[PDB]
């Protein structure tokens, strides 16, 4: 049972990008070249444009795993900057202590 | 993967293991709203009927 649709769409985009990634990587490798015949680049662009969206890594948004917040999320623990601060002030995770200098 | 965790929580709630007071309060509020006069709308009641 889920309550939010934004996190569901984000994780679905992540899964579809994880599934469809080798083809996009090969197309991007075939694109950026020095010389190379132009027909190969043209057909690579056609193949990468014929595929629909909902699979591009650009469409992936890093959000929290409990609150789904798009801004203010540390990549170390991957969550919002409120629940982590509260759990740190409660005295649970070691090391994360208030800066007393 | 929150799906398996939610399914396990619902299974423990139906069997009577994970005594979650939040779901109990939600069910209490739903029962109170139903007995007051605002039940959950069903198919065929609202705009058409």
């Amino acid at each position: 049972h889920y309550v939010d649709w934004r996190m569901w769409r984000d994780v679905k985009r992540r899964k579809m990008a994880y599934e469809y990634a080798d083809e996009r990587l090969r197309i991007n490798s075939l694109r950026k070249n020095t010389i190379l015949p132009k027909i190969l680049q043209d057909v690579a662009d056609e193949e990468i444009a014929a595929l629909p969206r909902d699979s591009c890594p650009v469409r992936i948004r890093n959000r929290c795993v409990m609150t789904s917040r798009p801004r203010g999320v540390k990549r170390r623990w991957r969550l919002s900057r409120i629940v982590f601060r509260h759990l740190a002030d409660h005295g649970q995770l070691s090391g994360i202590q208030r800066a007393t200098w | 993967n929150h799906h398996t965790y939610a399914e396990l929580m619902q299974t423990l709630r139906f069997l009577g293991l994970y005594r979650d007071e939040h779901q109990d309060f939600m069910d209490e509020q739903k029962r109170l709203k139903k007995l007051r006069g605002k039940e959950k709308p069903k198919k065929g009641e609202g705009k058409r009927a």
């Binding site: 309550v3 409990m66 789904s68 | 929150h2 965790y5 139906f14 009577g16 293991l17 209490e28």
Partner: protein
Amino acid sequence: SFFTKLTADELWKGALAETGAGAKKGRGKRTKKKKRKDLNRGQIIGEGRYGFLWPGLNVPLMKNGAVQTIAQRSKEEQEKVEADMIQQREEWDRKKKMKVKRERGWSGNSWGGISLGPPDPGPCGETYEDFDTRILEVRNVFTMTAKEGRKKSIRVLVAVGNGKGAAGFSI
């Protein structure tokens, strides 16, 4: 997403909001409020809507020198326990709606003429069982302070007496 389950006491405090500003300033009415009924009382450990007998959580374990099996209840027993829970919650609601017979004194909502009972005994070991306290005057006193605004103070005049000529009064 689904891990937003907090603690029960915090949920009850948020649903009731006892520290409301509308009750400490005289701006709102005391009748307009929400009542509370507890749910953690008549729920034994390991009780659901399917039925599973536990050899250690309910029935005795050592039954005639043998271990009992772990089966599943049918439908009639489930209906019976549901009816029992319904009767229990109905009895709870009935007990929570019955009001005690308030012994009136001189009139209706007036503390004058109400017997409080025997006074508190002294710490030395002296107990006053013959004397009886009586409420005479009750009034709410307000005073504009500096921070609390209208500080409410209750001033009650209670008299004492036993019935042998020796009596007194105090405010």
